[PDB]
Amino acid sequence: KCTSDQDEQFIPKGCSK
């Protein structure tokens, strides 16, 4: 997943996959 709660300025290692 990309957004855990609401992460608009932050994208993780594993966003769109």
Side-chain angles (χ1 to χ4, degrees):
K1 65 178 179 179
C2 204
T3 56
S4 184
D5 186 85
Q6 185 177 273
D7 295 89
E8 292 177 86
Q9 293 182 85
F10 177 75
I11 62 95
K13 187 179 180 180
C15 172
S16 59
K17 61 93 176 287

